[PDB]
């Protein structure tokens, strides 16, 4: 998992 939380809504 390399997805920062500000990119969750995308």
């Amino acid at each position: 998992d390399m997805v920062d939380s500000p990119q969750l809504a995308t």
Epitope: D1, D4, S5, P6, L8, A9
Partner: antibody
Framework: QVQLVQSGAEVKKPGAPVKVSCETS????????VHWVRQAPGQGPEWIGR????????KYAQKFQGRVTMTRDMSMNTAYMELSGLRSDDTAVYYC??????????????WGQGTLVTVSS | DVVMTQSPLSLPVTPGEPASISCRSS???????????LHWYLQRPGQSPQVLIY???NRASGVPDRFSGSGSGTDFTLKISRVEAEDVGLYYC?????????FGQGTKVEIKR
């Protein structure tokens, strides 16, 4: 309220591992990342890594990769952080932190009270 | 890693007078969705960091009305309108647009006499 509650202060000897716990309440544990930060005395704070409770996926900072392990328990709403190969430079206050964004909305950070870890013989 | 540069490092303030702490980032902390990922927190000795201002300008619950935050996507400011002995401590800006989270150098606020 949102509440992160860490285990007690630890005295370990050089090369011993320390396992800190972080128990949570007041929000859906699955929805937010649990990040781990530390502050050594005479040093600025430092981000160690992060765990996603639902997936279990972890990201660690390069300097910590290969000696830190983060796990979680969904049933007990608890996050853990096991650091190994301790030396005097690992003496610090260790803080678990709730992340900001959950998919729908982005909010504030919520910090645990801290856990002092003393590396000494 | 995003580089935060905070200034000034030391800040004596006469009681009642205001205080301004600046913090700039190497790249924009304004995400395209509109949210600015910069946070201001206070460190007193022997206790957890107290969140003062989050997501650029939003005041945290139970923080006094004299604390305020503003800024563009790269240049930020913490404003305290009336400093008192309660406010003495070590102030930090931090970014959470990208992991690793990175922190400013710190500002040591003290009362001036």
């Amino acid at each position: 309220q949102v509440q992160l509650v860490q285990s007690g202060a630890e005295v370990k000897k050089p090369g011993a591992p320390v396992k800190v716990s972080c128990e949570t309440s007041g929000y859906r544990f699955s929805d937010y990342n649990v990040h781990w930060v530390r502050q050594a005395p005479g040093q600025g704070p430092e981000w160690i890594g992060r765990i996603s409770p639902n997936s279990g996926g972890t990201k660690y900072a390069q300097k910590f990769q290969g000696r830190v392990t983060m796990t979680r328990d969904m049933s007990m709403n608890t996050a853990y952080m096991e650091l190994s190969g301790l030396r005097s430079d690992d003496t610090a206050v260790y803080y678990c932190v709730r992340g900001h964004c959950d998919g729908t909305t982005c909010s504030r950070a919520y910090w645990g009270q801290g856990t002092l870890v003393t590396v000494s013989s | 890693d995003v580089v935060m540069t905070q200034s000034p490092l030391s800040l004596p303030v006469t009681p009642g007078e205001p205080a301004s702490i600046s913090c700039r980032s190497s790249q924009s902390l304004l995400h395209r969705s509109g949210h600015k990922y910069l946070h201001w927190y206070l460190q007193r000795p022997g206790q957890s960091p107290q969140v003062l201002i989050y997501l650029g300008s939003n005041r945290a619950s139970g923080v006094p009305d004299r604390f305020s935050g503003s800024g563009s996507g790269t240049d930020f400011t913490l404003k305290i309108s009336r400093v008192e002995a309660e406010d003495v401590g070590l102030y930090y800006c931090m970014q959470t647009l990208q992991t690793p989270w990175t922190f400013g150098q710190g500002t040591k606020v003290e009362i001036k006499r």
